[PDB]
Amino acid sequence: ICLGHHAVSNGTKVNTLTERGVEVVNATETVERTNIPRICSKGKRTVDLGQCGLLGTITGPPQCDQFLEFSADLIIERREGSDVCYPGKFVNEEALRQILRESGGIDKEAMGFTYSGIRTNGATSACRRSGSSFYAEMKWLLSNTDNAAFPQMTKSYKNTRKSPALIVWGIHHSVSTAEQTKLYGSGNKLVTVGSSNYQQSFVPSPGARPQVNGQSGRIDFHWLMLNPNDTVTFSFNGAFIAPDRASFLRGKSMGIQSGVQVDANCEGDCYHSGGTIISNLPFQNIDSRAVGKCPRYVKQRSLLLATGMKNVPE
Amino acid sequence: ICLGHHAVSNGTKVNTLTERGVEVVNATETVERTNIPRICSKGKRTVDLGQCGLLGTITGPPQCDQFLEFSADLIIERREGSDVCYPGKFVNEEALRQILRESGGIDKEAMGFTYSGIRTNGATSACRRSGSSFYAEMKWLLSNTDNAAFPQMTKSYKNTRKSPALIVWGIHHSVSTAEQTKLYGSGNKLVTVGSSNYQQSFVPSPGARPQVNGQSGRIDFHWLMLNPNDTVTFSFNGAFIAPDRASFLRGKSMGIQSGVQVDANCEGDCYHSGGTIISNLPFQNIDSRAVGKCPRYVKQRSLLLATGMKNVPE
Amino acid sequence: ICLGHHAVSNGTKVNTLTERGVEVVNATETVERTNIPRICSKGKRTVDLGQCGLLGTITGPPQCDQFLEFSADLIIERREGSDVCYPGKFVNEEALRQILRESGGIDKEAMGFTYSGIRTNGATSACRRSGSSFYAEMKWLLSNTDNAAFPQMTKSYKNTRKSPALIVWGIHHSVSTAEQTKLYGSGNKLVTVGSSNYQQSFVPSPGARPQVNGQSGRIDFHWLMLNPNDTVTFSFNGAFIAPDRASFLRGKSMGIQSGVQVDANCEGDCYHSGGTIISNLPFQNIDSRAVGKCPRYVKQRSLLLATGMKNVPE
Amino acid sequence: LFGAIAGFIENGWEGLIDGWYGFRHQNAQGEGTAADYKSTQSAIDQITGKLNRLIEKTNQQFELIDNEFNEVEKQIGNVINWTRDSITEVWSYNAELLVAMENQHTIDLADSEMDKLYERVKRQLRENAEEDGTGCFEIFHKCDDDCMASIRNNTYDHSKYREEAMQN
Amino acid sequence: LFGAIAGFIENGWEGLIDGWYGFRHQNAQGEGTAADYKSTQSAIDQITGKLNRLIEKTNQQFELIDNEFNEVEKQIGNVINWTRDSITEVWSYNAELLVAMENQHTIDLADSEMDKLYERVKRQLRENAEEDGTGCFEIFHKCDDDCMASIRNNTYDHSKYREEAMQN
Amino acid sequence: LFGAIAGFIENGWEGLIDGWYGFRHQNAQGEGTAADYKSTQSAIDQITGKLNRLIEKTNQQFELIDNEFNEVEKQIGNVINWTRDSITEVWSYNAELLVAMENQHTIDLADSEMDKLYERVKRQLRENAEEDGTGCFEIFHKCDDDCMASIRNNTYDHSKYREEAMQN
Numbered sequence A, B, C: 001i002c003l004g005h006h007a008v009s010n011g012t013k014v015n016t017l018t019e020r021g022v023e024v025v026n027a028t029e030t031v032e033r034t035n036i037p038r039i040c041s042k043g044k045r046t047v048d049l050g051q052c053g054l055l056g057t058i059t060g061p062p063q064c065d066q067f068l069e070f071s072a073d074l075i076i077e078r079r080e081g082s083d084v085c086y087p088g089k090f091v092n093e094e095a096l097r098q099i100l101r102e103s104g105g106i107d108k109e110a111m112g113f114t115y116s117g118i119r120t121n122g123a124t125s126a127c128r129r130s131g132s133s134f135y136a137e138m139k140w141l142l143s144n145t146d147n148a149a150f151p152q153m154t155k156s157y158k159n160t161r162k163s164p165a166l167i168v169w170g171i172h173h174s175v176s177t178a179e180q181t182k183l184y185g186s187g188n189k190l191v192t193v194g195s196s197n198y199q200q201s202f203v204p205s206p207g208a209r210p211q212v213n214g215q216s217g218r219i220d221f222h223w224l225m226l227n228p229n230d231t232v233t234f235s236f237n238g239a240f241i242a243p244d245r246a247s248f249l250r251g252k253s254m255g256i257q258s259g260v261q262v263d264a265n266c267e268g269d270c271y272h273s274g275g276t277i278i279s280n281l282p283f284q285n286i287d288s289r290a291v292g293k294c295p296r297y298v299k300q301r302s303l304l305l306a307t308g309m310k311n312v313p314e
Numbered sequence D, E, F: 001l002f003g004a005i006a007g008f009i010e011n012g013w014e015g016l017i018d019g020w021y022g023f024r025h026q027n028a029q030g031e032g033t034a035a036d037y038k039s040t041q042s043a044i045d046q047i048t049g050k051l052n053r054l055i056e057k058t059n060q061q062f063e064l065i066d067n068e069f070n071e072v073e074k075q076i077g078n079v080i081n082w083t084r085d086s087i088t089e090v091w092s093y094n095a096e097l098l099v100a101m102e103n104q105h106t107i108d109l110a111d112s113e114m115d116k117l118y119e120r121v122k123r124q125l126r127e128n129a130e131e132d133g134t135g136c137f138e139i140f141h142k143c144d145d146d147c148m149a150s151i152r153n154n155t156y157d158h159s160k161y162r163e164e165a166m167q168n
């Protein structure tokens, strides 16, 4: 009697500790190369910001008007998005973005500031709504008359909540010392900001910036997280954009950046800019910056795992 | 004649390259789960800061009075600690903290600044000693009279030592432009600071901060490392807190943060906030932020290493 | 008939999964310990900066005069190098350095700024050439007369190129408010800078810094990357150093820091401060900060890989 | 490696499609070739164990640390990239080693199961047969096909067939 | 795997408490069961070698990079966490693989030592006995207990006991 | 481990300089000792395969992230160092494990090739010889040196030499 083993004509080459291209009966792939070019968002509260910028959800330019109090398991930033109507930007913008991506959305709340004999309806044709508007969650505080002066004010707010409050104010930088005074009066204007935690202060800086959105003025946006039962104070005298509402984080979420469509027909937990990586493979060669729950990125395209014996054909 | 092998009734399940729950005769744990809820500090020069904050050892609020010239192999930060009597804070506070943790303690040295017709005994009820005091290593420089003016000064110090000197000064920010002038006189006050290495400058920023320690003024603390035979200069004219003594690092140490007691009865080299990890195991599942000489943190609770053969009971 | 195996008198001890010092017939080293104390630069466009500092290639102090438009595959920083003639420094200096190391060199281009009734030939004995000069790529803009005043100017430049432009300006900080006014006239001087991307502004800060190069004044160097078809604007009124030429990155390169000589006789791709690591070994115990294409650094000095069987001598 | 598969056994049976390991004999009654479950199965139940161990679910979420629409500051940008490239080197290394190591073991495992099958049949015929040396066995008592079947399902009386092959 | 332990040997002796591998025979004089030092010891001295290699002292100190009383700035905070989580993934991976790989080898090592013990006794009785096939040996010359003891301590004359078992 | 090298074979031949595995016999005609290509070669072609797999070219460039002439800011400086030290721990770990794992396999591979050589010669002499037990074979028909040469190059008639050794 005699005994042997099975074989095939067409085998599959694998690599070993010692060899490189040994043919086995059957091997299987270990590295995922397959991408699905959609955001597989089946089962998740998803928010596609489109033209709204993630930071705009806090301040409220018109693109973000429908995102001021959103709730999410999954947040999608788009390329066409913008945090801004009136030209300007945030200090520590990415830190803030990272916070917002895993916030689970935001709840808004009146800080309850009241103003004593100044203007309050500052606007522009950069923030277009019915006519010339401004950021929905903010207040463009102005000297009472079309030149006038600004009475060094003090406003304060206390986080009487169990969760940290996101506080956001803006500093205005005008085209010139000319316009800076028409808006706020003359003199070097100073804004200070503190807490049982925080320590900073600000001065404007008028001058000609290039024209963005049709404007040469800018707005410096700044932010701080107030703690439960901690108080925050705004010593200010001009060049100042006042926070109307404060923000609280809802819970937990994931934030991604993509340019592909959403599909509630597929389930995914590993995302990148070009879609969803649905795989059970331990590795992947698609995007090293893939995020969520993903296989480890490897530089190798293919790594074949032997699932059979040596193929020795006659 | 016949031959077999040993076995037991009760075996221990392990995992293999191929199986998952194969019973062997004997296995041993590979992941440390056991914590000792004390700081095992047997044999080490240890310093428990208690209410003194690590940064306070440099400036010297009353909590830190007994820590102004300490020497250590092991430094413990406590939660109740504070770097501050008069409300304020440090710029690059954590960088400075990290430096101090591995300093091996500090030696203090007179910078030897002398002042020409101003005040020098600035104090407060926030730094309580015999009465109303200040930071022990600093000097609250004031305009000579209870309004007066401040003569734009110049003081300089040279590190005539073989080791880098830790230099620390403070900028005062008062409740208002009112108080800023009573203390230093009027005009925008400017402090500049440089070396064969460094380049910066400072302006105060009065205004109302919320009340901490009973005070609404703040103090900005700043710092720079002077090199052997390098010189540092202070062009100043007010809103300024002067360094009396400079600091030198003693050697090497370890710094940790904990809320558990010290035990000179046990020896440890791997520490976390909840105590000491004494183990010889290659891994641990206790604290991912454990520091010192530790086993690698792993997410797994248990990984049983086979120390015997297959257990095949009858 | 009988069969056995080969052996030797002198074997080589190796380590195994189970043993530690088992003698095999033959082993081979796995960790590279051999260094060649030269920069093996055979075949590469190499630039040794010597006394020129990498950042000086942008601004152009006299050391960098022959490096204003260089082209490289490999860039070498030297210890004797200096980014500066007139004392001063760069904000985000290392970020800028890292950009320049992999630029592949730089191409210079006239920004084309024209000035209206001021001075323009600011100089010093710190930048020595024929006599007292300045940075070659910059312009020391001055008030027209030996006290005079500075007309708040505006200059702007557009990147009409397909590649991002490196923009560099300087802020002057003088010995005093005395000298600040002789040079630029009185009043707080303000420089603002923006783009479809950027947002900042600057004020000088006169005072006495220690004497470096024989000078107590400093120059703050700042920089921004302009995008293709984006515009950058300089609202300024003094204490200002104007960019004459802008810079464009040539392609790709590698940058290292070394104190050893260059050899076009040897080929290397793994470099450190003490020379070149030429090896094919998977590991190395020479320099953990070795850069280029290198074997992985390991703490072990030697790891012997068995290339033979057990050596069992009689 | 054990020496069976691609050892003294010249090759395998591209017609054996019933299992991994089997019997092909030669007695008078014609011809037959079969497969062995338990050997085949023990190799199947082990390679299958390797795969189920390599397909997993890291309940470990990773978040954006970078920005593609708005590049983060260069210094931190380069530290992040440097760090990410370092982790990639490790995983690429780990992956290549894991697969090579596993493939080596998978292959030497299949050898093992063959040699284990062989050297058990060899022990079942205590002397009523001898080893040719190419994986084939020469009986000296003309085994029938309820006898060859008796071997394949492990019954074959290790004595009651003796002298008929012993004397010869 | 070699095929002895949990192979043709149905099981092990929960009464064998003298070693890992031993002899239990059956001759006229009654009964006895013993343990083999050198086999048992060579398995002991090897598993023991694995452990001494996994318990080590990384003279590599790591310092605080974070702050728990005073959280560091978010961006750097998130880079640190991201990085720490990445290293944790590696070590958790390494640890699981190391233990699985080692356990596999440990177990196939114990098999090896058995098969090595067996196939040496088998060679000590050049023909004065034959293999039953379940790890037991049938002598054809009624070995005594200073003869069984002669086997166990490797002395047994490989000739001077012959024909008494050969002829039979 | 298979049990040959540093097993029942007491030691090796420091005079065998023609290969890794060879034959040294003892018949009437005097003396001789030779080497076996194919066994030696299959061990050579496999250790050589391990080395060619460990010498590689990571087309992965790494750039300066630090500065030695001008130390970068402390916080970022310490994050970088912390991170670099973490990667060093991994590679030092990987390197030590890789080498230990490989060395184990390399050594058990050489054993395997011996045992594979042995247990093939043993099968070539179907009964015209028997196993002494120390890696040596006793023929019972006085093999000549065109007969010993006949074994070494695998020809030896597995029958036409029989009874001359069988009857004896």
Ligand SMILES: *[C@@H]1O[C@H](CO)[C@@H](O)[C@H](O)[C@H]1NC(C)=O
Pocket: A025, A026, A027, A028, A307, A308
């Ligand atoms: C080939 O390998 C894969 C392993 O995932 C398996 O699903 C497939 O059935 C195999 N094919 C055969 C017939 O061996």
Ligand SMILES: *[C@@H]1O[C@H](CO)[C@@H](O)[C@H](O)[C@H]1NC(C)=O
Pocket: A228, A229
């Ligand atoms: C927070 O708010 C509650 C309700 O006013 C108060 O009782 C509590 O003391 C506060 N927490 C602190 C910081 O003491």
Ligand SMILES: *[C@@H]1O[C@H](CO)[C@@H](O)[C@H](O)[C@H]1NC(C)=O
Pocket: B025, B026, B027, B028, B307, B308
């Ligand atoms: C079980 O394993 C451990 C290995 O560390 C050993 O100390 C202990 O003695 C073992 N028990 C027995 C009797 O096998």
Ligand SMILES: *[C@@H]1O[C@H](CO)[C@@H](O)[C@H](O)[C@H]1NC(C)=O
Pocket: B228, B229
């Ligand atoms: C440091 O101090 C000594 C003593 O004054 C001096 O001789 C030496 O030159 C100094 N080092 C430098 C920077 O030259």
Ligand SMILES: *[C@@H]1O[C@H](CO)[C@@H](O)[C@H](O)[C@H]1NC(C)=O
Pocket: C025, C026, C027, C028, C307, C308
């Ligand atoms: C020793 O090992 C190395 C492996 O790289 C090999 O080049 C050398 O020839 C070996 N020496 C001998 C004779 O085994």
Ligand SMILES: *[C@@H]1O[C@H](CO)[C@@H](O)[C@H](O)[C@H]1NC(C)=O
Pocket: C228, C229
């Ligand atoms: C860049 O320059 C070309 C040539 O002037 C112009 O046509 C193009 O629109 C510009 N790119 C942008 C930002 O539109």
Ligand SMILES: *[C@@H]1O[C@H](CO)[C@@H](O)[C@H](O)[C@H]1NC(C)=O
Pocket: D073, D074, D075, D076, D077, D078, D081
């Ligand atoms: C980091 O890497 C990405 C690609 O992974 C690249 O596009 C980006 O420019 C890099 N960041 C920096 C700061 O160079």
Ligand SMILES: *[C@@H]1O[C@H](CO)[C@@H](O)[C@H](O)[C@H]1NC(C)=O
Pocket: E073, E074, E075, E076, E077, E078, E081
């Ligand atoms: C980093 O991780 C710790 C826990 O390991 C967490 O408490 C902390 O909030 C995290 N830091 C940031 C910046 O989110």
Ligand SMILES: *[C@@H]1O[C@H](CO)[C@@H](O)[C@H](O)[C@H]1NC(C)=O
Pocket: F073, F074, F075, F076, F077, F078, F081
């Ligand atoms: C980082 O490590 C290097 C040596 O590798 C050391 O010289 C340097 O001081 C360290 N950096 C910091 C910020 O401590």
